[model samples]
Target: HTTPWTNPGLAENFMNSFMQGLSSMPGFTASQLDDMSTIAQSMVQSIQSLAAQGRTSPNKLQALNMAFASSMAEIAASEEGGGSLSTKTSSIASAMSNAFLQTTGVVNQPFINEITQLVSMFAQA
Candidate 1:
């Protein structure tokens, strides 16, 4: 199967287009969309590269979770409407996590849980 990462543009495109659905959710302002867009694009790109390299360990998921949380936390701390970045990023990451799981035919609960953990709160919280 052709891996998603090999086509460098694929992950970036998917993240950008998917934000249409992502943006529909409330509480994420336009200012936040730009930040989230960059984060989500990198998230997908990095995760796909890991998968491509046969490095789909739980550590990878943890890395994904940490990366998502830390980046969003940056926004969360800085924005006037702070603290909800976890909800935004976690929900967005959950969508992509599910997409990869379904596409790759992988059933890994902890991975899901890692992403799901931050829907309301990040690891720092």
Candidate 2:
């Protein structure tokens, strides 16, 4: 009976590590990384709240994913002026996406594909 609500702490840890990697990137300042981390935390909290409401509907989750992807792109664009992402940054993004998928119990092929696509979009700057 694994659900999205299960193992949130670990997910949070993964996100922290991901954010730390992003912070190390030359494109972002500490303040920007702090802001990005806050945004990511908020997104995780929103997902948790949705799970608490027992709202694991596919449409809602898909929308959440898209919104998160858009936000990530925005952050990257703001930091790098839409420059291509470094390999390390892209890998960190993949790790963060996996954490989200694991936390939300959304590890299906379609979801994975969508995440990959979105990560690529962000990587494209």
Candidate 3:
């Protein structure tokens, strides 16, 4: 099975773009963007570590789902109602959904539902 760490490339890219957008906003400096990047990189590593340990249970997947959604939400909130971050977030969500669907070879309703809800919320916010 492909590992979770093997996934999230699109997510990383989205986050990088989101951070760049944040840096463009007022009151945020390059240093703050670097800090945000560092934190995001850390979160990615943590998710990789957790997946490496075989923590792919339903609850763990739910948490991962939530984290991604929350990150997207924060990105949206950082932007001033621009739909760019929302577009990128949706792309990430689609990639994540495809990853999970391909990884398990079975439809997980709750996980899928949560992901859809979170992504929808992100887009609407």
lDDT of 2 by residue, 60-123 (tens): 6556655655665566544643234554346445555555554553544454365456556765
Give the poorly placed runs of model 3, Cα more than 4 Å off: 1-40, 47-61, 80-89, 107-110, 119-125
Give all TM-scores, in the order shown: 0.47, 0.53, 0.40
- lDDT (tens digit, per residue) of candidate 1 on 24-94: 66556788878877887778778678767876555556555456545654554455562265565565555
Worst 10 residues of 3 by lDDT: 1-10
Candidate 3 global CA lDDT score = 0.50
User: How far in Å is the alpha carbon of 114 misplaced in model 2?
Assistant: 7.5
Alpha-carbon lDDT of model 1: 0.55
The lowest-lDDT stretch of 10 consecutive residues in candidate 2 is 1-10
Model 1 segments more than 4 A misplaced: 1-21, 81-125
lDDT for each candidate structure:
0.55, 0.55, 0.50
- Considering every candidate listed, which one attains the maximal TM-score? 2
Better of 2 and 3 by TM-score: 2
Cα TM-score of candidate 3: 0.40
